Paper text:
The Redβ protein of the bacteriophage λ red recombination system is a model annealase which catalyzes single-strand annealing homologous DNA recombination. λExo and Redβ have been shown to interact in a 1:1 monomer:monomer stoichiometry to form an Exonuclease Annealase Two-component Recombinase (EATR) complex (a.k.a. The N-terminal domain (NTD) mediates oligomerization and contains the catalytic functionality.
A single turn of the 1-start helix contains 27.8 asymmetric units, each corresponding to a Redβ177 monomer. In general, the Redβ N-terminal domain consists of a mixed αβ fold consisting of five α-helices, a 310 helix and five β-strands, which form two separate β-sheet elements. This superstructure is stabilized through substantial electrostatic contacts between adjacent monomers in the complex. The outward-facing DNA-binding groove accommodates both strands of the annealed dsDNA product, with an observed stoichiometry of four base pairs per Redβ177 monomer. In addition, the incoming strand is stabilized in a planar orientation through a π-stacking interaction between the phenyl ring of F66 and the purine or pyrimidine ring of the position 3ʹ nucleotide and two hydrogen bonds between R128 and the adjacent nucleotide at position 2ʹ. The annealed duplex DNA is also stabilized in an extended, planar conformation in the DNA-binding groove, which is atypical of B-form helical dsDNA conformations often found in solution. It is likely that upon annealing, the planar conformation is maintained through an induced distortion in the phosphate backbone of the inner (template) DNA strand, which is stabilized by a network of seven hydrogen bonds with R128, W143 and K154.
Numbering used by the authors:
A (entry chain A), B (entry chain A), C (entry chain A), D (entry chain A), E (entry chain A): 3 to 132, 139 to 169
The structure:
Amino acid sequence: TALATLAGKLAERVGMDSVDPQELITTLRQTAFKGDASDAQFIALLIVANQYGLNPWTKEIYAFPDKQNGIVPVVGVDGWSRIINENQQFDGMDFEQDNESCTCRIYRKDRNHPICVTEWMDECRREPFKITGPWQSHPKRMLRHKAMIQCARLAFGFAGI
Amino acid sequence: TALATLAGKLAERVGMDSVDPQELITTLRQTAFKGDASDAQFIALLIVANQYGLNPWTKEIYAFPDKQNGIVPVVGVDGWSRIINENQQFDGMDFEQDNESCTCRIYRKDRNHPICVTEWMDECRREPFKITGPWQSHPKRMLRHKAMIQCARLAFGFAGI
Amino acid sequence: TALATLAGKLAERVGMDSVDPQELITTLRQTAFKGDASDAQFIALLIVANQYGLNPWTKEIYAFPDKQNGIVPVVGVDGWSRIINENQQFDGMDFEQDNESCTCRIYRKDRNHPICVTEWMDECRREPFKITGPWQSHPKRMLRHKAMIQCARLAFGFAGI
Amino acid sequence: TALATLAGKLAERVGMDSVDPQELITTLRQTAFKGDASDAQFIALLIVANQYGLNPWTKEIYAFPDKQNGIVPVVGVDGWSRIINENQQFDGMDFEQDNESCTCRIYRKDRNHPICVTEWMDECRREPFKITGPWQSHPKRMLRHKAMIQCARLAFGFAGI
Amino acid sequence: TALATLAGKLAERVGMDSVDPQELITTLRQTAFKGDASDAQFIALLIVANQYGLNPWTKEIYAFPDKQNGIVPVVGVDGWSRIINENQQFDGMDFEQDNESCTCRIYRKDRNHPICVTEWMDECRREPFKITGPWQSHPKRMLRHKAMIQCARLAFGFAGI
DNA sequence: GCAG
DNA sequence: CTGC
DNA sequence: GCAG
DNA sequence: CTGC
DNA sequence: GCAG
DNA sequence: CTGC
DNA sequence: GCAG
DNA sequence: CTGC
DNA sequence: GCAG
DNA sequence: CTGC
């Protein structure tokens, strides 16, 4: 039942009145939950994403199905990129990199002291699946994503969201 | 049903009253979704593009059909080019390039510290399909597109859109 | 009974009216309480998390089932990251690390004297379970989490929350 | 009788109306009083914790059952960490440590003279139970907890709480 | 009779309406008076603690049953720690220690001259009972408690309480 | 990763 | 012209 | 740990 | 393409 | 002690 | 993947 | 003396 | 995992 | 003299 | 665990 009013209201938002809900629900469920996902897991992702204050369609927040029908949420690089950019006290940021590490420093206008975090590649890197992943094809970008996330967890966090 | 009122209303916007909807729907579906695409995937692209705040006809945002009838969205260089240009706090940008890297730095009026990102060609470049692509015929432009996108993800993101 | 109104109200918050509560309750219970958990233990986690002033869905606070049907609460790195960031008197922080220790110093605007704490790896590190954990794959990050928590216990604590 | 209205009111505080009180009371009793505890000992912990001005669910204050059905209260490191942090005259603190001692000095804004206390490990350390405790696995942290408590007993105490 | 209204009112202070008073009275009597104590001795401790201006539940003041049914009051280290900390004229304190003595000096804002007292271990120390006491396991702390008490008797006393 |  |  |  |  |  |  |  |  |  |  409830997924048909969600699919309908979302369609009505783009002016697409009177869709067949079943093919649309299925399409949308496989968009946010890539892979198999009970409707109970799909509606759980919608309420959890609202608790974080983040948008699932935009891929600001992911989730994957747990063993025994729970879910596991995962805030992405775009979720943290929202959180630091819609706060008025942010004052810019800078980075440093080499063959093995990345450093990221965040400044804010009210706080006198910048906050700085350093990440390390050989603990962040992942082995090839099975086969080729982004940790094989793009390593120097993939580490800089991780160092920004870890700094924004401390400089801002979820406080005020 | 709903695609015929979409095709009709869009036509009525250019003063083309009383079109035959079936040939127009087909034409329009193959414009935004290049290649085969269920109507459920086509109406999903319309609602997702509205969630990002971007226009599909203008190619600010693409999508491709997933395996098992989902979709995958892709914000293009014109989507980020909109997002940084319709924000009042943007204060210009500069670039640096060589045989192997591109750097892009974005300034904003309220933030004291510029934000700067660097991209690398030999991880961004793609192998020839099958046959000749833009990563064969235009490499020095194709990298500069990637470095602008990656910087605009951090300097602005989706915050306030 | 009471879990069905909780699951319902939470769904109504995301606009998902008239869900089947049983599959949703089960999904949600296994999200916050990973593993087996009586409904009496699940409702105990909800009231305890409110007493700390922290959110369970966001993983700011965990709990695990005790022997003889109690529970054990555990404030996480995101719980302390909230608490120091939603307080107006925080004035930034800095860190120091090596092969064996981490130091963290917290400043505040009203207090003249910074507060500083040091942690040590060979007492904080954990042995492999059974098999590979984060204390095997990520040690230099895992220690820095512990040193921030221990400092924030003294510089702020639960005073005013 | 009275425990069912306590369990009920606490549940009503998290919006969980109409719980079965018996499983909840049992769960809660085993949370605050770990181990066996008469209801008369459980309600005694609630009134004593109010006299100190501290919260039992948060583990700011513990108690254990006496021989002949009394109780013994124990203010924890988080109880003293509350008491020094919710007082306006606190002005920061500093520490010193070595192989055998810890010193802690507390400053306050109105008092001209700081107050300083020193603790010693070989009198504070405890022998292994029966088997491995925190006085085996974490000694350098476990002593620093004791030195802060002992200083805060003199610099603030219970005056004004 | 009177103990049931005391136990009741105290419970009503923590919101525990309609307790069985007999098990609660017994629990509370054995908390403040550890060991056997007539109800006449228990109500005598309550009125005497009010005359000193100190709280019995908090262990600011102890008592023990006399031979021939009197009582003996004993102000503790927390009773003196209250008395010097809730007085506005206190101006901090300092200590000196060695193998055999402890010195404590108290300053106050209105009085020009600090007051200083010295204690000695071999007269303060106690022999083992029967078996191991705090005068065996913690001697350097146990003496510093005695030197603070003796100084606070002269620098403040009960004047104005 | 989708640009020409 | 491609998507784990 | 989820990015391309 | 993965989750203790 | 619970993070990835 | 763990809790005296 | 109760912390992890 | 402990309390004279 | 009663603290842990 | 103690009180002349």
